[PDB]
Amino acid sequence: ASAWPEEKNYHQPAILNSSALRQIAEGTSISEMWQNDLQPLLIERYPGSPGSYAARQHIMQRIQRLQADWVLEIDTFLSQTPYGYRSFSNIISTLNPTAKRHLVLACHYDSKYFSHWNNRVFVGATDSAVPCAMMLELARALDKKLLSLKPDLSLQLIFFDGLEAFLHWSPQDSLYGSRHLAAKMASTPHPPGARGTSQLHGMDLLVLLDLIGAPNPTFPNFFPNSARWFERLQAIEHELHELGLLKDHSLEGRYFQNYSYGGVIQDDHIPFLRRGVPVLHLIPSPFPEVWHTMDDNEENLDESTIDNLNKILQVFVLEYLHL
C-alpha cells in the first residue's frame, strides 16, 4: 500500500525570489477583479433563489473562459431544512481531476436569507462575495502558470452552497453544502480505481476563506497541524511588505498575527476537519463589524486590504504548487 497520502506531511514550498514576488504583485488587478468578478456577485443569492442560479452561472462562466484545463462539477443534492426539503448545488472546479493530491481553496457562495427590510437587501459582500471573487481573480491571475499543470499535486476550488442557516445557526440548519460534500468525498475512492484511499486523503490542505473584505482583519493560527503553513503566510506577508509590494500596510497592523485561538469557529471546514483534513482557516477574529447586517455591502469593503490579501494568497499557492 503506497504511502502517498503521507506526502502532504513533508511537502515543502518552492519559495519565490524577489523578482518573482514583484511579478505576482503586478499580475493581479484589484480593479479588474472588482468589476468583472465581484460586482456580478453582489446580489441576493440564498439557496434555491434566482440569485443563487445567477451566481453559479457567473462563477462557472468566469472559470470556463480561462486557458487552464479546469474541470467543473456541480454537486446537487437535497437536504431537510426548517422550510422543508430543498435543493443545493456546490461548485467544484478542479485542475487534473485524477491527480492524487490537491491543494484546495474554498469559500461559500450563498448569502444568508433575510427578508427585505426597509428596501434594503442583504448581499454579504465580505460574507462571502469577496472571498469568491478572490478565488476567481486567483484563477485568472495565475492562469498562464496553472496551464503548465495540464509531485502528483494540483489545484482545486470549491464554492459551497448553503453555508448559512435559513433561520438562526444550529447543528441541523447550517453547513448544508460542506456536510454533504465532505461525506461524499470521504466515500469516493481516489484516485479512480483505488482500493482504500478516498478523495479526502487526497486533500493536502483546505484553505477556507470567509468574512474577508473589512479593514484590519487579524487571522489567528487555529490548528497545530497547519501551523507551518500559517507561518508561510506570515513570511509571505512580511516579505511582500518589505519589498514595498503591499498598499497602506504596516507590520504592527499585519493580518497574520502570532496567536492561537482556544475555541472553535463553526464554518464549512468543520465537516472536513472532523474527518481528518488539515485546514488553514482564513476567517478573521473578531468578525467584520458589519457581519450579518445590511451594511455588509460594497461601500464598506476595504479595497487595498483585499488587494494585499490577493497578492499573499497568490504567492502562497504558487509556492505550494512549485509554480
* Phi, psi (degrees; rounded to nearest 5) at 20: -70, -35
Q: Which is nearer to Zn ion, 94 or 128 (CB)?
A: 128
| Residue 170 β-bridge partners | 173
- To the nearest whole angstrom, how small is the minimum distance from the Cβ of residue 128 to Zn ion? 8
- To the nearest whole angstrom, how small is the minimum distance from the Cβ of residue 127 to Zn ion? 4
- To the nearest whole angstrom, how small is the minimum distance from the Cβ of residue 32 to Zn ion? 26
Half-sphere exposure of 307 (CA within 13 A, CB side): 18
- Residue closest to Zn ion when measured from CB atoms: 127
* Contacts to Zn ion by CB under 5 A: 127
Cα 193 to Cα 100: distance, rounded to the nearest angstrom: 12
Number of other CB atoms surrounding residue 279 within 10 Å = 23
- To the nearest whole angstrom, how small is the minimum distance from the Cβ of residue 36 to Zn ion? 24
Q: Which is nearer to Zn ion, 42 or 315 (CB)?
A: 42
Q: Which is nearer to Zn ion, 127 or 268 (CB)?
A: 127
Q: Which is nearer to Zn ion, 37 or 127 (CB)?
A: 127
Q: Which is nearer to Zn ion, 127 or 319 (CB)?
A: 127
Round the CA-based radius of gyration of the chain to a whole number and report it: 19
**The C-alpha cell that represents 204 in the structure block:** 493536502
- To the nearest whole angstrom, how small is the minimum distance from the Cβ of residue 292 to Zn ion? 6
Q: Which is nearer to Zn ion, 203 or 211 (CB)?
A: 211
- To the nearest whole angstrom, how small is the minimum distance from the Cβ of residue 49 to Zn ion? 16
Q: Which is nearer to Zn ion, 28 or 126 (CB)?
A: 126
Sheet holding 153-160, edge to edge: 71-79, 86-94, 153-160, 101-108, 203-209, 279-282
Residue type for position 61: Q
- To the nearest whole angstrom, how small is the minimum distance from the Cβ of residue 302 to Zn ion? 18
